[PDB]
Amino acid sequence: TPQAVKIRADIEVACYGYEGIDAVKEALRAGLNCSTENMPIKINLIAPPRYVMTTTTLERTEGLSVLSQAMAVIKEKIEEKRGVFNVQMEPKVVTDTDETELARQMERLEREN
Amino acid sequence: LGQPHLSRQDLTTLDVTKLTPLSHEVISRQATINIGTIGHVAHGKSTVVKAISGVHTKLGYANAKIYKLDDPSCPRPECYRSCGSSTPDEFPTDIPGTKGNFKLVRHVSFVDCPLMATMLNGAAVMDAALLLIAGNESCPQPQTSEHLAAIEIMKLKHILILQNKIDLVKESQAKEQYEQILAFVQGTVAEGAPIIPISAQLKYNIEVVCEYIVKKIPVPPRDFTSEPRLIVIRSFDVNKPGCEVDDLKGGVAGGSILKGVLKVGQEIEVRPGIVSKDSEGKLMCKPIFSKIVSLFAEHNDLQYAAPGGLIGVGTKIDPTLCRADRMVGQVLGAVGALPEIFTELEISYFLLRRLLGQKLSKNEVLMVNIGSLSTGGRVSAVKADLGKIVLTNPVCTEVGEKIALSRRVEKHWRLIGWGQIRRGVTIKPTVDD
Amino acid sequence: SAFLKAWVY
Ligand SMILES: Nc1nc2c(ncn2[C@@H]2O[C@H](COP(=O)(O)OP(=O)(O)NP(=O)(O)O)[C@@H](O)[C@H]2O)c(=O)[nH]1
C-alpha cells in the first residue's frame, strides 16, 4: 500500500451570540459525522478560534475530499447559527515536520495561558 | 455540590431578601467582605494575607475563613483562628486543655495590590483595610502616607493598623515607633483605628488580627435585591490545547459582584460587549449575551454568588472573547439590567497637591481607570474642578461613579487624581432580536 | 482636613 497518509486542515470557528460554544460544538460534531469507516476524522483545538482537523487515508485524493466536504458541513452549521467560519489552511498532506511545528506551537500556547 | 461538607445552596429555596453578609449558606463557600492590604514596599502586605489565609496570590484576591472556639475556657485572644476557603465550617480545637469546636464566624477576602487607581475609581470595593507599617522603618514612609490619603478620600472608616516585623525589633524601638503612628493618624480618617503588633513571618498575634477583624469591622450593608452587576477583572479560556470537541468549555469571567445575586442558569449580557467600527469610523457596540453555566469562588462551587470575594462565572461565551483577559473592563449582569455605554464624560475632578512618587489642558493625553477598564482618553474642555473627556474605548458605567486619571509623567504612567462623572454621551446598543 | 488638602487641591 502507499503507506497511509496523514492529512490536515486548519479551520477557524466561532460564535458570538446566545449559543456560543454549544453552537461551535455542534458544528464541529457535524464535521465528525462526515468521517468514513476507512477514514475517521479527528478535531482537536489549537487555540480559539482555530482548530485542527486530521485524517489517515490510503489515498490523498479520497482524504483531501473527505476533509474538504466536512469543512463545508461545518461552515454551513456555524453560519446557520449567526457564527463565523474561515479556513486557515486548505487540507494538505501533513509532513511530520509540519506536525512538529504544530506540537511545538501547542506547547507555546499552553505557556501563553 | 462538589464539596459535600459545605452548605447545600439551593435555588428553589433562595430568598434574596433573607441574605446577609453572614448567611451560613453563603459564607460557608464564599467571602462576603473585602479587606484591602496597603503599606509600602516590603512592609509584608502580601505576607500577612499569606499568613491569615494560606493563599499565594492588576489586583489580587485571597479568601480566608475566620473561626471562634465555642469554649468559655479559651484564654484571649486564642479563641480566634483563620483558614483556607475550602475548610470545614466546624472543627475540634487544637489547643490542649481546651474543649469544643472552632465554629465559622466570618469569611473575608483580602484585596492585595502591588492600588491607588483601583481605590479611587472603586474598581475594588474595599469594605475595610489593613494598614501595614514596618517597625524597622519610620512613620510615615512615602507610600504609607499616600495610601492613608487614599483611604481618607475613599471614606473607609473601619481600619486596623499592623506594626509588622516585631521579630527583628526590640521593645524599646518598637514603642518608639508607636507615637509616630499615633501622631500620623491623628487628624486623619484613621485616627480611631486600633494598632496591633504582629510578625507576618513568624505569624505572631495573627489571632488578634482575626479577633479585631470580627470585632472592629462591622457587617457592611449590601445591595442583594437589585438585579446584579459584576466587573470583569479577569477573563479566561479554560481549554488547554489539544482539546477534543465534546470537552470544549466556555470562557470564564472573573470579577467582584457589586449588587444582586448571580444564579446558575441565569441569563446574562455584557457591556459594552463587542466593539466595532462603522463606515465613518463611528463606534458601534453589540452586547454579548449568554447563560451562566457554573459559579466559583476559589475552589468552591456555588449555585448563587453574592458581592464579596472574586467570583468566577462559567458561561457559553466563545473562549475567543474571554482568552488572555480580553473581557477585562467589561461589565456583566442580568439582561436589561446593565448600565448605559459611554464614549464621552463630563467630570468634576481633584488632583494630588503633592508631586508624589498640575491641572488640565485641552487635547491632553490621559489614561483613565473606570471600573477595571484602563482606557486611553483625551481632554475636550476645562475648568478649575470640572471638565470633559473623550474615550478611546467605550465603557459601561454610571453617572456619579468615581474615575481615576493618569499622565505619562517621566514618559510613563502615574496617577494624578480623580473625579466623579456628572454627565456623558452614550452609544445606542445594536441588538439582533 | 488640612492633611488631605496638603495632598489635594
Ligand atoms: N512580613 C515580613 N516580611 C518580611 C520579614 N523579613 C523579610 N520580609 C520580606 O517580606 C517579603 C514578603 O512579603 P512583602 O514583599 O514584604 O509584602 P508586600 O508589602 O505585599 N510587597 P508588595 O508591595 O511588593 O506586594 C519577603 O521578600 C521577605 O524578604 C519579616 O519579618 N516579616
Numbering used by the authors:
A (entry chain B): 185 to 297
B (entry chain A): 10 to 66, 80 to 136, 141 to 383, 396 to 471
C (entry chain C): 426 to 434
From the publication, what sentences describe this entry?
In mammals, two related regulatory subunits direct the catalytic subunit of protein phosphatase 1 (PP1) to eIF2P: PPP1R15B (CReP) is constitutively expressed, while PPP1R15A (GADD34) is an ISR target gene that is part of a negative feedback loop that quantitatively dominates rates of eIF2P dephosphorylation as cells recover from stress. eIF2, the physiological substrate of the PPP1R15-containing holophosphatases, is a bilobed trimer.
To test experimentally interactions between human eIF2γ and the repeats of PPP1R15A, we sought to crystallize a minimal complex containing eIF2γ and a single repeat. After several attempts, the expression of a multicistronic plasmid encoding eIF2αγ and CDC123 in Escherichia coli yielded reasonable amounts of monomeric eIF2αγ. The PPP1R15A420-452 (R3) peptide and eIF2αγ dimer, purified separately and combined at 8:1 stoichiometry yielded diffracting crystals, and a structure of the complex was determined at 3.35 Å resolution. Residues 426SAFLKAWVY434 of the PPP1R15A420-452 peptide could be built into the density, with the conserved Phe and Trp facing the groove, a configuration in agreement with the AFM predicted model. The groove in human eIF2γ that engages the helical repeats of PPP1R15A is broadly conserved in eukaryotes, including species such as Saccharomyces cerevisiae that lack PPP1R15 regulatory subunits, implying that it is a feature of eIF2 that predated the emergence of PPP1R15 regulatory subunits. The biochemical counterpart to this feature of PPP1R15A is an interaction between a shallow hydrophobic groove on the surface of eIF2γ and a repeated segment of PPP1R15A with helical propensity that projects two bulky hydrophobic residues on one side of the helix (Phe and Trp) into the groove. Our crystallographic data are limited to this helix-groove interaction, but MD simulation suggests that PPP1R15A’s affinity for eIF2γ may be buttressed by additional ionic interactions between conserved acidic residues in PPP1R15A and a basic patch adjacent to the hydrophobic groove in eIF2γ.
